[PDB]
């Protein structure tokens, strides 16, 4: 259900993720670090399962942020992949991949991997 | 097939991995970077499935290397997880995780991930 996913979410290191879920399966929004302020804000695009299995199953979703806005360009892109579990405490549990542009010789050490949990605070 | 893992293997970048596979699942040997000078060598240890399935499946394996020896200490460790495939053209197909010892503040950026394909050529 797109409604449960729509809102303001936060991760354990203080970053902010604002998102809207469209009825055709689209995800659109912005991602920002705890420094806050205008720019630390970057555009995000993703997809989710608009018709989830019933059960007590989670809803699968994923999104990308490329780290370039009008103030900085870090020359890297991050993708998060996980699932939305609703209830009193709704959470999005994920694993992420961060790739940096490198020359051919340093290509072998271009990607970092890690994991993030988001608690919701507003629609 | 099983014991086919013992030997000398090379990844796509010239690094050499020399391994011995024990009848009950142990993996032991050394790893050395390309250039090949005699301490670029570091110690490795691991485990593999010593009784694999009889349908056409590969043999599951894994191993670790901490990046310290008598000359250098790079305060890191790498693990490779994957499967051996035998035949006229034998290979070991893997993925790996490289973690560095960091402070609490840098803990989120401590691990890299990549993939490697080892052949006897």
């Amino acid at each position: 259900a797109e409604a449960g996913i729509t809102g303001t979410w936060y991760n354990q290191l203080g970053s902010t993720f604002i998102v809207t879920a469209g009825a055709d399966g689209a995800l659109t929004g912005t991602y920002e670090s705890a420094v806050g302020n205008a720019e630390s804000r970057y555009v995000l695009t993703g997809r989710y399962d608009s018709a989830p299995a019933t059960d007590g199953s989670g809803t699968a979703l994923g999104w990308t942020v490329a780290w370039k806005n009008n103030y900085r360009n870090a020359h890297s892109a991050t993708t998060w992949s996980g699932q939305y579990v609703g209830g009193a405490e709704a959470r999005i549990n994920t694993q992420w991949l961060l790739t940096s542009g490198t020359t051919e010789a340093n290509a072998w050490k271009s990607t970092l991997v890690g994991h993030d949990t988001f608690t919701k605070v507003k629609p | 097939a099983e014991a086919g893992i013992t030997g000398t293997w090379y990844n796509q970048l010239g690094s050499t991995f020399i391994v011995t596979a024990g009848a009950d699942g142990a993996l032991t040997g050394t790893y050395e970077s390309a250039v090949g000078n005699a301490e670029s060598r570091y110690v490795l240890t691991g485990r593999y499935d010593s009784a694999p399935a009889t349908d056409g499946s590969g043999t599951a394996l894994g191993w670790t290397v901490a990046w310290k020896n008598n000359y250098r200490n790079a305060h890191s460790a790498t693990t490779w997880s994957g499967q051996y495939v035998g035949g006229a053209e034998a290979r070991i197909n893997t993925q790996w995780l490289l973690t560095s010892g960091t402070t609490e503040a840098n803990a989120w950026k401590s691990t890299l991930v990549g993939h490697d394909t080892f052949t006897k050529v």
Binding site: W108, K109 | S15, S33, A34, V35, Y42, W67, R72, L98
Partner: peptide, 7 residues
């Protein structure tokens, strides 16, 4: 070159 793992 600057990590023992590759080349």
């Amino acid at each position: 070159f600057c990590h023992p793992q590759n080349t």
